[PDB]
Design a protein around this ligand. Sequence first.
Ligand SMILES: Nc1ncnc2c1ncn2[C@@H]1O[C@H](COP(=O)(O)OP(=O)(O)OC[C@H]2O[C@@H]([n+]3cccc(C(=O)O)c3)[C@H](O)[C@@H]2O)[C@@H](O)[C@H]1O
Ligand SMILES: Nc1ncnc2c1ncn2[C@@H]1O[C@H](COP(=O)(O)OP(=O)(O)OC[C@H]2O[C@@H]([n+]3cccc(C(=O)O)c3)[C@H](O)[C@@H]2O)[C@@H](O)[C@H]1O
Ligand SMILES: [Ca+2]
Lengths: 189, 189
Amino acid sequence: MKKIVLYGGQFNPIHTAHMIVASEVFHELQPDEFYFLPSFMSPLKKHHDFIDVQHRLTMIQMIIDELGFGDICDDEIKRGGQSYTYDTIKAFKEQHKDSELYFVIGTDQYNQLEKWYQIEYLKEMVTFVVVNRDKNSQNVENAMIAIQIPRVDISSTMIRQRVSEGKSIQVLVPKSVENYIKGEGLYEH
Amino acid sequence: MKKIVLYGGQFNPIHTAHMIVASEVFHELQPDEFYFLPSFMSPLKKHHDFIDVQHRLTMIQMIIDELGFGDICDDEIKRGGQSYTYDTIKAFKEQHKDSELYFVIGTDQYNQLEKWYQIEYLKEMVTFVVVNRDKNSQNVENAMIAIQIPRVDISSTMIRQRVSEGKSIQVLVPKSVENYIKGEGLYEH
Ligand SMILES: Nc1ncnc2c1ncn2[C@@H]1O[C@H](COP(=O)(O)OP(=O)(O)OC[C@H]2O[C@@H]([n+]3cccc(C(=O)O)c3)[C@H](O)[C@@H]2O)[C@@H](O)[C@H]1O
Ligand SMILES: Nc1ncnc2c1ncn2[C@@H]1O[C@H](COP(=O)(O)OP(=O)(O)OC[C@H]2O[C@@H]([n+]3cccc(C(=O)O)c3)[C@H](O)[C@@H]2O)[C@@H](O)[C@H]1O
Ligand SMILES: [Ca+2]
């Protein structure tokens, strides 16, 4: 009966398009809880210049402070290794029986979902919520939920690329995160 | 030799994509001055539900506060009527000779520049600076400047439409503008 939304990501760093996704899903679904779920290492991704965990969590808290909703689920950081969503959700669900689970992903992840670990079991445990990325609308099958957001082409890779070349990231992240990155020397080469 | 940028708009309301445009242009061209230039009534657009002029100026100043650069140029508000850019620039330039003038527009205005008043004369007085809108890349002729920005599909129409239907505009405008719209009851029906 309780509605719980989880939004998974490497969040390296979290940015203004992640904020728009979270805001739109939260206001459309009106869940009882909303969790940002930072991975330790997200599968299907290379983890190069691994800054460590405290920095990523701090910037996610700065987003929550500004949005005025949300919590961090640190299960994946505690577990370490490759962060397979099926392992996360199996454990989360038995700590929160009697609630409906919603897992938010963008278009890029939706299109490679057959490559996720234990995907047939995970699709029975959560309702996937898919937001449009690099296009203006997203179609899904009737078992899933599509949420249409204003299209915003910002990525974490773009942010790290800019910082390394000395280009501004003003607006692309909130002011708090911008000053944190500069202040801590994150992504500088 | 002094470099001056003007960024014209109806700004009804100013929003997060306008801030991205301004930030990208400012950091790329490093002008000596940067002016937000609000029109009274911009040509080639319908002006139904005309709010007080002071509301628009207040929201623009909140963007300036956040960005940390820029000033309002109120020339068109003082003049009233249809706000033809040729008239604006002819007057502005006779108060700022010895300066190079740059005028920022997005793709939609670029594509209809033949419909602008006295366009042949205006192209001699300013360098047009074009940012991509509704696409990822903008080509221009060699006399103009293209600045590539992260594509962000937010419009003022979107903002007004959301507000009227009771939909959230969180993140799509800054928090100060969001609370200002709500408290002044703007765009409510
Ligand atoms: N501009 C934008 N517009 C709309 N959506 C945007 C976006 N930028 C990122 N996104 C989305 O936000 C999210 C965060 O992106 P980013 O921080 O890169 O994170 P990402 O590496 O994309 O991982 C997203 C989640 O999927 C999980 N996953 C991925 C692959 C395999 C498996 C498995 O279990 O086998 C699990 C992963 O652990 C994590 O919880 C993603 O869903 C992404 O599509
Ligand atoms: N998401 C987005 N991404 C990239 N660019 C975006 C954008 N949203 C708006 N823009 C752009 O920002 C600007 C502000 O938009 P908005 O507030 O609607 O304003 P708008 O009505 O488009 O007017 C822009 C300027 O052009 C002038 N103009 C227009 C037509 C005819 C003539 C004439 O002299 O005959 C003069 C007008 O007076 C004003 O200074 C525009 O350049 C628009 O293209
Ligand atoms: Ca809590």
